[PDB]
């Protein structure tokens, strides 16, 4: 009773056991969602319903335990925040989706309420510590790219304006609007059928179309290369910075041992 429970129950939630236990629950719930299937017995559907109910309450006590220990800090970790949303959506998607669709009927909901399934897959990222590590690593790369992504987006916009006006009048399915031209230039950037599918047909009508797309390919390839090179040397800087300090620290360790002893050589003259 009292905070003695809180001290003991933190020793549960923060335990390596509890983390691993929840991981297997997610895996098992992910597996049951693989045998869900329209062509099946009513008896299989009824059994899966109860099993899916068992999971939804079982993850509920997980969220309650995690909130009970982390409290005001729980609603600030993006990982814990995601898990909470998924449990809420998974409650609605099994005990209220029908009551919604039967009144707020929309054809999207029969396709959007599936999100309760996709969310329970993504929990396998949030629960596994090695997966949180790799995902946060990938996300932290994005801020360094924003300036070159903005540049690429601006170059695309300029070329989409030009391609619409140059080629859109006679090839509207490819360049007839700014949106058409944006999509087609993205295809060209990926080099997908860029010549046989796009630029060779154009040159039957616009012989100098190659003067547009070949410089385009050089630019966006050059910017993509420099984008990747930036990521490489950014990650390398994170390494080198560590090696640098260790060498400086040892120089300052060496500074300690030598200088703080060579000081004594002037007072040890009394010997």
């Amino acid at each position, epitope marked *: 009773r009292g905070s003695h429970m809180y001290l003991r129950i933190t020793n549960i939630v923060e335990s390596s056991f509890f983390t691993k236990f929840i991981i297997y629950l997610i895996v098992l719930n992910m597996v049951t969602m693989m045998v869900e299937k329209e062509g099946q017995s009513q008896h299989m559907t009824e059994v899966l319903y109860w099993i899916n109910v068992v999971f939804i309450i079982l993850f509920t006590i997980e969220i309650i335990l995690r909130i009970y220990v982390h409290r005001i800090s729980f609603f600030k970790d993006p990982w814990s925040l995601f898990d909470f949303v998924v449990v809420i959506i998974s409650i609605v998607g099994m005990f209220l989706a029908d009551l919604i669709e039967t009144y707020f009927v929309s054809p999207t909901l029969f396709r959007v309420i599936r999100l309760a399934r996709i969310g329970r897959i993504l929990r396998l990222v949030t629960a596994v510590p090695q997966m949180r590590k790799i995902v946060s690593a990938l996300i932290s790369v994005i801020p360094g790219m924003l300036s070159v992504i903005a540049l690429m987006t601006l170059f695309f916009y300029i070329f989409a304006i030009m391609a619409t006006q140059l080629f859109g009048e006679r*090839f509207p399915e490819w360049f007839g609007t700014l949106g058409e031209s944006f999509y087609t230039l993205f295809q060209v950037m990926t080099l997908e059928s860029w010549s046989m599918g796009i630029v060779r*047909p154009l040159m039957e*009508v616009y012989p100098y179309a190659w003067v547009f797309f070949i410089p385009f390919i050089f630019v966006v390839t050059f910017v993509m290369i420099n984008l990747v090179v930036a990521i490489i040397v950014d990650a390398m800087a994170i390494l080198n910075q560590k090696e640098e300090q260790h060498i400086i620290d040892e120089v300052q360790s060496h500074e300690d041992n030598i200088n703080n002893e060579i000081i004594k050589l002037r007072e040890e003259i009394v010997e």
Partner: antibody
Amino acid sequence: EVQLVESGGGLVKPGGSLKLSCAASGFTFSNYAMSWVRQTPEKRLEWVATISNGGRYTYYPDSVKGRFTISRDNAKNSLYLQMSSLRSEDTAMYYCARHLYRYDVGGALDYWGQGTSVTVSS
Amino acid sequence: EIVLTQSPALMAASPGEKVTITCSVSLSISSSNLFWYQQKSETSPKPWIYGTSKLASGVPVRFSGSGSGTSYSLTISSMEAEDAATYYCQQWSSHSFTFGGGTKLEIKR
């Protein structure tokens, strides 16, 4: 061989409606824009509709805007012209024609069907 | 919306004669965008010259085309009896095809 055959036509009353159909063979129909061209009884040729190869863009002269509707089915390899509010002006041989270049909605009409006569008369 | 006008409307011509017919354009157009068709009695038009001067596949090399800007022409160096037909010039601009009035060749006996 490339081949185009129009069908429908015949006699309509003014204000009436009629649907022409064109069947295409011997080429990748979905690679080409298609057009309909009138030939009036005094043998003047007059373009009346164009459709892009994917069907998403359609073009008409002001003489028929909103009265006619060009459409295509790339699976059936067929082309249609829904005509409505027909007038005596619209009495003509109607030809189905393929564009010279692929995807190009302009340029020239390199193959023409045999035509179907449409008479609009009371 | 560009109008194409052709002259003459009828041309009484004799085998072996050099025949030349004109298509005049109410605006300057690219010579790559002007086309010629040949239509024979109770058949559909067939493409004849692509751009101002490139003959279509199978056109007898006695045919030729020349022009630029607002004025274009089709020529037969020496007429043959099979050339008796109506010839239509055509252009494309904006998003509209327009056709010339046609020139009917009349073989002279």
